[PDB]
Design an enzyme around this catalytic site. Structure first.
Site, PDB file in Angstrom:
ATOM      1  CG  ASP B  25      -1.899   1.118   1.271  1.00 19.35           C
ATOM      2  OD1 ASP B  25      -1.903   1.944   0.348  1.00 19.35           O
ATOM      3  OD2 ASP B  25      -2.693   1.200   2.239  1.00 19.35           O
ATOM      4  CB  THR B  26       2.444   3.266  -2.799  1.00 19.24           C
ATOM      5  OG1 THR B  26       1.284   3.528  -3.600  1.00 19.24           O
ATOM      6  CG2 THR B  26       3.210   2.109  -3.424  1.00 19.24           C
ATOM      7  N   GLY B  27       0.233   4.360  -0.440  1.00 20.44           N
ATOM      8  CA  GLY B  27      -0.407   5.451   0.290  1.00 20.44           C
ATOM      9  C   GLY B  27      -0.701   5.181   1.762  1.00 20.44           C
TER      10      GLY B  27
HETATM   11  C1  LIG Z   1      -8.445   5.549  -0.839  1.00 14.70           C
HETATM   12  C2  LIG Z   1      -9.725   4.710  -0.782  1.00 14.70           C
HETATM   13  C3  LIG Z   1     -10.469   4.866  -2.116  1.00 14.70           C
HETATM   14  C4  LIG Z   1      -9.409   3.251  -0.413  1.00 14.70           C
HETATM   15  N1  LIG Z   1     -10.611   2.442  -0.393  1.00 14.70           N
HETATM   16  C5  LIG Z   1     -10.886   1.448  -1.154  1.00 14.70           C
HETATM   17  O1  LIG Z   1     -10.244   1.194  -2.296  1.00 14.70           O
HETATM   18  C6  LIG Z   1     -12.019   0.585  -0.690  1.00 14.70           C
HETATM   19  C7  LIG Z   1     -11.491  -0.649   0.051  1.00 14.70           C
HETATM   20  N2  LIG Z   1     -12.806   0.227  -1.862  1.00 14.70           N
HETATM   21  C8  LIG Z   1     -13.999   0.692  -1.910  1.00 14.70           C
HETATM   22  O2  LIG Z   1     -14.451   1.451  -0.926  1.00 14.70           O
HETATM   23  O3  LIG Z   1     -14.813   0.372  -2.910  1.00 14.70           O
HETATM   24  C9  LIG Z   1     -16.269   0.438  -2.786  1.00 14.70           C
HETATM   25  C10 LIG Z   1     -16.851  -0.466  -1.705  1.00 14.70           C
HETATM   26  C11 LIG Z   1     -16.056  -1.203  -0.799  1.00 14.70           C
HETATM   27  C12 LIG Z   1     -16.624  -2.025   0.193  1.00 14.70           C
HETATM   28  C13 LIG Z   1     -18.019  -2.111   0.271  1.00 14.70           C
HETATM   29  C14 LIG Z   1     -18.821  -1.386  -0.627  1.00 14.70           C
HETATM   30  C15 LIG Z   1     -18.247  -0.566  -1.608  1.00 14.70           C
HETATM   31  C16 LIG Z   1      -8.748   3.112   0.935  1.00 14.70           C
HETATM   32  O4  LIG Z   1      -9.113   3.762   1.897  1.00 14.70           O
HETATM   33  N3  LIG Z   1      -7.727   2.259   1.100  1.00 14.70           N
HETATM   34  C17 LIG Z   1      -6.921   2.218   2.324  1.00 14.70           C
HETATM   35  C18 LIG Z   1      -6.827   0.840   2.965  1.00 14.70           C
HETATM   36  C19 LIG Z   1      -8.078   0.297   3.536  1.00 14.70           C
HETATM   37  C20 LIG Z   1      -8.797  -0.637   2.801  1.00 14.70           C
HETATM   38  C21 LIG Z   1      -9.974  -1.141   3.342  1.00 14.70           C
HETATM   39  C22 LIG Z   1     -10.397  -0.690   4.594  1.00 14.70           C
HETATM   40  C23 LIG Z   1      -9.656   0.210   5.351  1.00 14.70           C
HETATM   41  C24 LIG Z   1      -8.489   0.727   4.802  1.00 14.70           C
HETATM   42  C25 LIG Z   1      -5.469   2.599   2.142  1.00 14.70           C
HETATM   43  O5  LIG Z   1      -4.851   1.493   1.496  1.00 14.70           O
HETATM   44  C26 LIG Z   1      -5.120   3.907   1.416  1.00 14.70           C
HETATM   45  O6  LIG Z   1      -3.799   3.716   0.890  1.00 14.70           O
HETATM   46  C27 LIG Z   1      -5.215   5.124   2.343  1.00 14.70           C
HETATM   47  C28 LIG Z   1      -5.053   6.520   1.735  1.00 14.70           C
HETATM   48  C29 LIG Z   1      -5.660   7.632   2.570  1.00 14.70           C
HETATM   49  C30 LIG Z   1      -4.996   8.155   3.684  1.00 14.70           C
HETATM   50  C31 LIG Z   1      -5.561   9.180   4.443  1.00 14.70           C
HETATM   51  C32 LIG Z   1      -6.812   9.702   4.098  1.00 14.70           C
HETATM   52  C33 LIG Z   1      -7.484   9.192   2.990  1.00 14.70           C
HETATM   53  C34 LIG Z   1      -6.908   8.162   2.235  1.00 14.70           C
HETATM   54  N4  LIG Z   1      -4.485   4.952   3.593  1.00 14.70           N
HETATM   55  C35 LIG Z   1      -4.900   4.869   4.801  1.00 14.70           C
HETATM   56  O7  LIG Z   1      -6.170   4.802   5.200  1.00 14.70           O
HETATM   57  C36 LIG Z   1      -3.787   4.839   5.836  1.00 14.70           C
HETATM   58  N5  LIG Z   1      -3.772   6.133   6.548  1.00 14.70           N
HETATM   59  C37 LIG Z   1      -2.681   6.799   6.557  1.00 14.70           C
HETATM   60  O8  LIG Z   1      -1.655   6.254   5.901  1.00 14.70           O
HETATM   61  C38 LIG Z   1      -2.609   8.155   7.268  1.00 14.70           C
HETATM   62  C39 LIG Z   1      -2.060   9.260   6.342  1.00 14.70           C
HETATM   63  N6  LIG Z   1      -1.845   8.067   8.515  1.00 14.70           N
HETATM   64  C40 LIG Z   1      -2.112   8.252   9.775  1.00 14.70           C
HETATM   65  O9  LIG Z   1      -3.298   8.207  10.402  1.00 14.70           O
HETATM   66  O10 LIG Z   1      -1.039   8.483  10.531  1.00 14.70           O
HETATM   67  C41 LIG Z   1      -0.966   9.034  11.873  1.00 14.70           C
HETATM   68  C42 LIG Z   1      -1.437  10.454  12.023  1.00 14.70           C
HETATM   69  C43 LIG Z   1      -2.143  10.767  13.191  1.00 14.70           C
HETATM   70  C44 LIG Z   1      -2.624  12.058  13.421  1.00 14.70           C
HETATM   71  C45 LIG Z   1      -2.415  13.070  12.478  1.00 14.70           C
HETATM   72  C46 LIG Z   1      -1.711  12.774  11.300  1.00 14.70           C
HETATM   73  C47 LIG Z   1      -1.241  11.478  11.098  1.00 14.70           C
HETATM   74  C48 LIG Z   1      -3.741   3.611   6.757  1.00 14.70           C
HETATM   75  C49 LIG Z   1      -3.777   2.331   5.927  1.00 14.70           C
HETATM   76  C50 LIG Z   1      -2.408   3.546   7.518  1.00 14.70           C
END
Ligand SMILES: CC(C)[C@H](NC(=O)[C@H](C)NC(=O)OCc1ccccc1)C(=O)N[C@@H](Cc1ccccc1)[C@@H](O)[C@H](O)[C@H](Cc1ccccc1)NC(=O)[C@@H](NC(=O)[C@H](C)NC(=O)OCc1ccccc1)C(C)C
Ligand SMILES: Cc1ccc(S(=O)(=O)NC(=O)Nc2nccs2)cc1
Ligand SMILES: Cc1ccc(S(=O)(=O)NC(=O)Nc2nccs2)cc1
Lengths: 99, 99
Positions: B25-27
């Site tokens: 997961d590059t993001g």
């Molecule tokens: C970007 C979305 C379109 C993506 N979602 C999808 O592709 C979903 C699964 N697909 C989808 O929703 O399709 C339709 C659907 C699905 C299910 C049911 C019905 C319909 C997603 O969130 N994918 C995420 C993984 C995931 C998958 C399933 C369920 C839960 C999580 C990360 O891989 C993706 O790479 C994101 C990018 C992102 C970051 C921040 C905001 C918005 C987007 N990273 C994350 O969610 C990560 N957060 C972070 O990397 C943040 C930046 N760090 C963080 O909180 O650090 C500490 C911090 C604390 C306080 C202040 C600042 C930082 C997490 C995996 C570590």
């Protein structure tokens, strides 16, 4: 390029005649961008991630340019805090993960 | 090796005795796995993305095998629906994006 991950993978994108920075994300099925006016009709959609869901507008067949690499495909708009380029667009520019 | 992005970039890992799947997961800044059992003293930590935030447990110097590449780093443990391998370990294993 070949891009490292020491730093976040945020590149320059062009869409709607506007320059933005976005994150190349192998963790996203779909391409979701922060709030922005865009052409044509849309449909309602939800996307999920860490800590739940949010609503977005799906738009189809949108021209986007990503570090000079053109793609037409689907782009979602809504309350993302980060511009994300997901796999649907990463494929169109030839993007691979290698190690 | 080479991972093109037509499907979710899933890979085999081995961590605390067990075999699992996890998304490259590059993001993702951090690495975050489904609830499991890792050793000793952990600190609370907060991570968020789309839709909200979760509470996790931080475990440091955790050894992990990702596609045959060994790595040592911070693993986060909590209620994520998918196992996520973030840039903290992607960098150790020499992972970059190519287009
Ligand atoms: C970007 C979305 C379109 C993506 N979602 C999808 O592709 C979903 C699964 N697909 C989808 O929703 O399709 C339709 C659907 C699905 C299910 C049911 C019905 C319909 C997603 O969130 N994918 C995420 C993984 C995931 C998958 C399933 C369920 C839960 C999580 C990360 O891989 C993706 O790479 C994101 C990018 C992102 C970051 C921040 C905001 C918005 C987007 N990273 C994350 O969610 C990560 N957060 C972070 O990397 C943040 C930046 N760090 C963080 O909180 O650090 C500490 C911090 C604390 C306080 C202040 C600042 C930082 C997490 C995996 C570590
Ligand atoms: C490749 C690429 C060129 C140019 C852009 S742009 O300046 O952001 N806007 C457009 O091209 N808009 C459109 N023109 C006709 C149909 S949609 C984006 C992407
Ligand atoms: C290469 C490789 C060998 C072995 C593993 S393992 O069996 O899953 N773990 C460990 O052996 N030790 C530790 N796990 C956590 C802290 S110390 C993982 C990866």
């Amino acid at each position: 390029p070949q891009i490292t991950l020491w730093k976040r993978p945020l590149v320059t994108i062009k869409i709607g005649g506007q320059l933005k920075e976005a994150l190349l994300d192998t963790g996203a099925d779909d391409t979701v961008l922060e709030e922005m006016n865009l052409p044509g009709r849309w449909k309602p959609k939800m996307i999920g991630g860490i800590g739940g869901f949010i609503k977005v507008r799906q738009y189809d067949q949108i021209l986007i340019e990503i570090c000079g690499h053109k793609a037409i495909g689907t782009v979602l708009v809504g309350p993302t805090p980060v511009n994300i380029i997901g796999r649907n667009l990463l494929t169109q520019i030839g993007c691979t993960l290698n190690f």
